[PDB]
Structures are given as structure tokens and as C-alpha cells.
Ligand code: HEM
């Protein structure tokens with residue numbers, strides 16, 4: 001039948017039937033395809049499928065060693081095979097997990113920062129058991145990663161999925177995100193993208209401050225239990241106030257953004273095992289904040305105000321006012337982060353670094369999964385070198401997958 | 414153990430243990446005692462208890478006739494007995510139901526308007542089956558009762574309780590009531606008494622207008638199904654704008670109140686049967702609006718503003734400013750209703766009418782159940798004659814009982 005297509009700017013959906021007349025459709029520009037998602041479960045991974053995946057991963061791990069260790073490799077293969085037969089699953093050694101988190105990052109097609117793949121701090125929280133313990137592990141992660149502005153890449157691995165009925169899940173999209181409230185006067189306040197989740201927190205008892213930059217609480221689910229809400233300690237959230245190196249009126253906008261880009265809802269998959277809760281972070285690329293968070297019409301939508309304040313021909317598109325504005329906003333973002341000593345990289349230096357990483361990957365392992373659509377910056381496309389680089393997008397393992405929103409697949413009891 | 418005691422002005426609860434030292438406690442001033450409540454059920458009324466109640470009621474009904482009808486009485490006794498045996502319950506004839514609604518009103522200890530007991534319009538909605546049908550019946554009731562300001566007493570009887578798992582219930586306390594929102598700025602807006610129910614409606618998808626006089630939607634439950642929300646047609650809600658016959662600044666307060674006092678959450682009990690949904694209405698007594706709705710510290714709390722506007726010594730209680738203010742507010746209420754041709758009676762004329770009704774009841778059936786605590790007006794106590802009248806409070810049958818709030822005893826599926 002029809003293929004559902006969505007416009008993220010207007011939220012409109014369209015149904016494609018015409019593709020049926022195709023000579024041989026391409027789902028390339030789809031944000032969340034099923035091929036990139038790992039849904040929930042009701043019973044453990046069938047032993048028949050888990051086993052071969054595990055063997056493959058142990059072989060990958062032992063193959064990494066410059067100086068091979070055949071005995072340990074064979075021994076581990078034996079132990080893993082036996083463990084899966086005596087328990088149903090298996091536990092990774094801390095070293096294997098570290099390797100897995102890095103390979104998964106290394107295998108993320110949609111990430112430009114992959115040249116940093118080998119530099120990741122891993123926090124092993126596989127022994128965690130309560131929401132409260134998750135919250136502490138997260139506060140620890142936030143604190144280590146922020147590092148007073150000198151951002152460090154890290155990841156916290158919670159307990160792996162067992163029977164799918166007892167998994168750990170962070171209901172947040174990112175560790176730190178701002179609230180979005182649809183004011184009584186019809187207007188939207190704060191981050192429009194977190195409108196629904198904001199209502200969820202409010203439903204769960206959270207206290208709405210109705211500001212434009214209120215950090216939402218951590219909503220944590222442990223051992224398949226109902227989620228518990230935790231306010232993030234303000235002392236842990238490092239923010240940057242926005243100001244332009246020129247244009248002293250920029251600061252009058254009262255804009256700021258958090259310094260920690262930490263993905264919180266992805267699933268790690270390695271050797272057949274799946275970790276439903278494994279928050280990670282790197283540092284920001286200027287355009288994420290300057291172009292998308294501030295300028296997306298569905299986010300902060302500050303373009304017109306900035307253009308108007310710059311005295312541009314705001315009512316005539318051909319004036320390229322939008323181009324001029326967005327660039328000044330990116331300048332503000334980079335300027336502020338740098339002035340306040342918070343790590344950030346511009347979308348040129350990063351593109352160039354990704355290009356170096358790519359050539360490195362090709363000679364190291366003959367390939368690099370890349371999703372051109374996500375890798376090319378939201379501005380200056382053809383100015384960056386990644387735009388002119390042909391790439392192949394494919395899914396390997398270990399890998400970070402999306403997941404269905406937990407509030408959609410969950411029961412009170 | 415301890416007896417729980419509550420202060421409705423502060424919401425504070427106290428635990429009474431000292432009563433254990435009593436020589437022989439009185440639960441007289443308790444608002445909702447268990448003796449006045451009829452809770453939910455899980456199975457039909459045991460046949461052993463239902464039968465004798467039914468016979469008692471049929472005897473009461475046939476005893477009412479000035480000219481006795483022995484044959485029909487015996488015949489009806491026989492038919493009812495048989496029907497309960499062949500079905501489990503029984504159906505009242507329309508005439509018996511009318512009689513039941515009036516006797517129950519006649520048996521309401523907490524009502525001063527009982528001199529009007531024989532004048533009640535009964536709408537038979539026992540054949541109703543959906544929320545939508547309930548809503549139409551209610552709109553019909555509201556329209557008939559309002560009568561363009563010439564208020565008429567009426568009651569709509571929905572299907573009786575069967576097994577307790579399929580009953581009709583209006584989740585509203587009154588047909589027409591105003592919303593109460595706890596504003597983002599910490600203040601409460603509108604009717605503080607409907608704060609929780611307002612949140613319920615908002616949870617059920619209702620659209621909050623954040624005003625101080627927004628009519629809440631009808632929340633109807635039919636055949637034990639989940640409740641459905643219905644906005645009351647504005648054309649049906651007759652309101653009165655408040656203004657003082659002198660003091661032209663009174664209207665500047667922007668106060669008003671609905672003209673229809675319609676109790677929506679009480680249960681009718683007759684001959685063993687219980688009707689969980691049977692909204693009824695009479696007309697207003699000035700003090701309900703002027704003293705309690707406007708002046709209760711937990712409702713509109715307009716006393717200080719009115720006192721201040723009257724130029725009274727607002728900061729010195731001994732000045733009796735509160736006394737002076739509340740009386741001017743009652744004057745406003747009566748004045749407005751009368752000017753706008755909407756039925757209402759002052760708390761003097763009504764007290765005197767209740768007293769006439771009481772002497773009537775004593776000679777007619779040797780008694781009148783009266784709850785002195787509710788019958789004496791909230792102002793001018795000893796000035797009204799009911800204050801000096803000793804009365805006995807007792808529960809008869811038919812009777813209107815309270816019920817546990819439905820959101821407390823209900824399941825999605
Ligand atoms: C250290 C510097 C890093 C930079 C500058 C960087 C930058 C980026 C950028 C620009 C995106 C696009 C996000 C968006 O458009 O919403 C992204 C996505 C992503 N990055 Fe990186 N990243 C870094 C570190 C990491 C680390 C440490 C991991 C994993 C351990 C990682 C995993 C991913 C993944 C899986 C995505 C998924 C995008 C999605 O589908 O939502 N990144 N990164």
C-alpha cells in the first residue's frame with residue numbers, strides 16, 4: 001500500500017502510492033526508518049539467533065588485538081557458548097563492553113564526530129537496579145562529561161535487556177533538554193519539540209515553571225517498573241549565555257543553551273545483546289544550536305527577530321536576509337562558547353575532520369558507513385568537503401539504534 | 414481508634430482520640446458521614462434484603478392515596494414479589510417514581526425549600542443507554558428548569574443500578590459549575606472548590622480557558638463505561654451579572670453567577686432500588702451565592718475587596734466590617750436576580766417558609782427530618798426562626814444519598 005511521508009517543519013503527512021509505478025522507492029531521507037529501530041520485547045532473544053551473533057562479536061573483539069591471543073579467544077568462545085546454554089544470555093567482560101561502545105560509535109552513520117571514536121569514557125552501571133541508582137549514575141555522567149566546560153565524551157551502560165519485560169529506559173530524548181509549554185494565550189513557550197514530553201512530566205507530577213529555558217526532569221525507568229521523575233541538580237547543568245562579538249543587542253535576546261549534547265534514548269546492540277539504556281555524549285557542533293535549535297521554525301524560530309534587529313529586508317526573500325541572519329547567529333554561538341571556555345567545533349573544521357577520519361577508516365578496515373544526508377551541515381553545504389564525498393550508508397554491529405517512545409509501549413501494571 | 418475531623422476552610426485534618434474517655438462522640442457537624450453515603454457495588458442487591466424494602470415502598474405508595482385502592486395494592490405487591498423472583502430486581506411504575514422523587518425531597522434533612530416538595534417535574538430517562546443520550550436529557554432538563562429565569566424545580570431519573578458494574582453517573586457535583594485553575598503565577602483563578610475536577614476535565618481533553626467564570630463541561634458515565642466530556646451549550650446557561658442598587662462600583666468587580674442550582678451527584682434510593690444518576694434542581698436562596706460562594710475563604714473570597722471598597726476598617730475585626738460587607742453582597746445578589754427577573758429567595762422568607770412546612774409535616778405525618786446545622790442560614794442565624802426550633806435529624810426512605818467520587822472508584826477496563 002501507501003508509504004507514509006512526513007514534513008517535520010509543518011508536521012504534515014502524505015501518502016505515497018505513485019512509487020508503485022516505479023520501473024524497479026528510496027527511503028533515504030526518512031528520519032526514523034524501521035531498519036534503524038529496535039523495538040521492545042516480550043520474551044528473551046531466541047537462543048538460535050543470539051548464539052551466532054555472540055560468536056561473531058567475540059571474533060570481532062579478538063580480531064582487534066594487534067598481537068593475537070588465540071587461546072583466550074577460543075576459551076572465551078567456549079565460555080560464551082556454554083554460558084548462553086546454561087543461562088540463556090551472557091555477560092560481556094568490561095573490556096568487551098568498552099570495545100563495543102566505541103565500535104558502535106565508530107559504526108554510527110549519522111555522526112560527523114567519529115574521528116574521536118577511540119576516546120570515550122565508559123561508566124559500567126550494569127549492576128544498577130533502581131531508578132534512584134540510575135539518577136545517581138546519570139548525575140555522575142553529567143558531572144564527568146561537563147568537566148567545567150572542557151567537555152569529555154562518555155557513555156553510561158545500564159543493565160542489558162533480558163526478557164524485554166524488565167528493561168532500563170530513560171524516557172528523555174537527551175539528558176539535558178528544555179521544556180515546551182503551550183501557553184494559555186495560544187502561544188508556545190520554550191522548546192516546541194519537547195511539548196509532548198513536557199506534558200508527560202507535568203502529568204507525572206513535575207512542576208511547570210513556564211519559562212523559555214527550563215531544564216526538564218530526568219524520567220527514569222528501571223527493571224521495567226513505572227518511571228520515576230528526578231529534577232536535575234542545577235549545579236550540574238552548565239549553560240552558555242548568547243552574545244555576538246559585535247551587535248551588543250544580541251545579548252538582549254536573552255538566549256542561552258546547555259553545553260552538554262547527550263543522547264539519552266538510543267539502544268546499544270552488541271553480539272546479540274541489547275542495552276535499552278545507555279546515554280552518551282560528545283561535544284557540540286555549532287550548527288546544531290545556531291542553525292537547528294535556534295532557527296528551525298519548529299524549535300526556537302529566532303530568525304525573523306534577528307533579521308529584523310540586523311535591519312535586513314525581512315519581507316523579501318530574494319534579499320537573502322535569512323542567509324545573513326543565520327550566519328550571525330552561528331557566529332554568536334561559537335563566540336559565546338569560546339568566550340565562556342566551553343568546548344564546541346564549527347561546521348567546517350568538523351567536516352574536514354570527518355573527511356580525515358573517512359580516509360583513515362578506508363585504509364584501516366576498507367569502509368565507513370556514512371549517511372550523507374545527516375553528515376552534511378544544515379548550512380554551507382557545498383562549502384564543506386563532505387558534500388562532494390560519495391558515501392555508502394549501511395548498518396553494522398555493534399550499533400546504536402532508535403527505539404519506540406516508551407510511553408507508547410508501557411503499562412501501569 | 415481515632416475519629417478523623419476536618420476543617421473545610423483550611424483543609425486541615427485532626428485525629429480525635431479523647432472521645433474514648435467519654436462517659437457514654439457526636440458526629441453531628443460532620444459534612445459527609447458514612448450514614449449519609451451509598452457506595453458502589455460489585456453485584457446485585459441480595460434478594461433477601463431487596464424484597465422487604467420493595468414491599469415497604471409499595472405499601473407507602475398505596476398508603477398515600479386519599480381513596481385507597483386495595484385490589485391494585487395487593488396486585489402490585491404480588492407482581493413486584495414475582496418480578497423480583499423472575500428477574501432479580503423490579504421496575505417502578507412512572508407514577509411510583511414520581512412519588513419516590515418527591516418523598517425523597519420531602520425526606521432531605523438538609524433542605525430548607527421542602528415546602529415545595531410536591532411541585533417537581535420528573536423526566537423519565539430510565540431507558541437511556543449512552544453518554545450522548547444522557548447529555549441530551551440533561552440539556553433538556555437545564556432548558557426546562559431555567560425557563561428564561563422563571564426557575565422550575567425538576568429531576569431527571571436515569572437507569573437504576575443493576576449489578577453495580579453498569580451504572581450511570583454524572584461526575585460533576587452540579588450541572589453548572591465554574592472552573593478553578595491554579596495559575597502558573599501561584600494564584601488560584603475561578604472556583605477553588607472545583608480545582609481537582611477541573612484538572613480531571615483537562616486530563617480528559619477539555620480545553621481550559623483560564624478565566625474566573627468558565628462553565629465546566631458535563632462529564633457523563635453511562636452503563637459503567639468510561640466517562641465522556643460534553644461542553645454545555647452557552648445558550649442554555651443563564652447567568653446574572655452582579656450589581657448593587659447603590660454603590661455603582663459593585664459592578665466594577667465583574668462578578669456574576671449562574672441561575673441554576675442543580676445537584677448532580679446524589680443517589681436516589683427507593684424500595685431497595687438505587688438510582689446513581691438523578692440530577693435535580695430547585696431555585697437559589699440568596700445566601701448560597703452571596704455568603705458561601707462569594708465569601709467563603711475557599712471559594713471566591715471577595716470579602717476584603719468589598720470591605721475595602723466600602724471604606725471599612727478592614728484591619729480591625731472588632732469594627733464588624735465583615736458583617737457590614739457580607740450584607741451588602743447579599744443585597745447585591747438579591748437585587749441583581751430580581752432586576753434580571755431570575756427566581757431567588759432571601760434567607761428569611763425561606764426560613765419562615767420552612768417553619769410553615771415543618772408545622773404542616775408534623776400534623777400530616779407526625780414529623781419532619783431536619784438537620785439544624787444545614788437549615789440555619791450562614792448569616793443572621795438567631796434572626797431566622799429556624800434557629801430557635803428544636804429538630805430531630807433522621808434518615809428515612811426514599812432518600813437522596815451522597816456517593817463516593819467516581820474517579821476514586823473506577824477502572825479504564
Ligand atoms: C565528541 C564530539 C562529537 C561531535 C562533535 C558529534 C557530532 C554529532 C552531530 C553533529 C550529530 C547530529 C545530531 C543531530 O543532527 O541531531 C551527531 C549524531 C550522532 N552521534 Fe555524534 N558527535 C560526537 C560524539 C559522539 C559520541 C561520543 C557518540 C557515541 C558514543 C556519538 C554518537 C552519535 C550518534 C549515534 C548519533 C545519532 C544521531 C541520531 O540518529 O539521532 N557522537 N553527532
Ligand code: HEM
Nearest residue numbers: 518521523524525526529566568693694695696697698813
Ligand atoms: C425549590 C427551591 C429549593 C430551595 C430554595 C432549596 C434550597 C436548599 C438549600 C439552601 C440547600 C443547601 C445547599 C448547600 O448549602 O450547599 C439545599 C440542599 C439540598 N436540597 Fe434543597 N432546595 C430547593 C429544592 C430542592 C429540590 C427540588 C430537591 C430535590 C428534588 C432538593 C434537595 C436537596 C438536597 C438533597 C439537599 C442536599 C444538601 C447536600 O447534602 O448537599 N432541594 N436546598
Ligand SMILES: C[C@H](O)[C@H](O)[C@H]1CNc2nc(N)[nH]c(=O)c2N1
Nearest residue numbers: 008028029030031373374375376
Ligand atoms: C531528511 C529528513 O527529512 C530530515 O530533515 C533530516 C535531514 N538531515 C538531517 N541531518 C542531521 N544531522 N540532523 C537532522 O535532524 C536532519 N534532518
Ligand SMILES: C[C@H](O)[C@H](O)[C@H]1CNc2nc(N)[nH]c(=O)c2N1
Nearest residue numbers: 421441442443444523786787788
Ligand atoms: C458542619 C460542617 O462543618 C459544614 O461547615 C456545614 C455547616 N452547615 C452547612 N449548611 C449548609 N446549608 N451547607 C453547608 O455547606 C454547610 N456546611
Ligand SMILES: CC(=N)NCC[C@@H](F)C[C@H](N)C(=O)O
Nearest residue numbers: 261262263282283284285288
Ligand atoms: C553529540 C552531539 N554533538 N550531538 C548529538 C545529538 C544531540 F545530542 C544534540 C542535538 N543536535 C541538540 O542540538 O540539542
Ligand SMILES: CC(=N)NCC[C@@H](F)C[C@H](N)C(=O)O
Nearest residue numbers: 674675676695696697698701
Ligand atoms: C437547590 C438549591 N437552592 N441548592 C442546592 C445545593 C446546590 F445546588 C447549590 C449550591 N449551594 C451553590 O451555591 O452553587
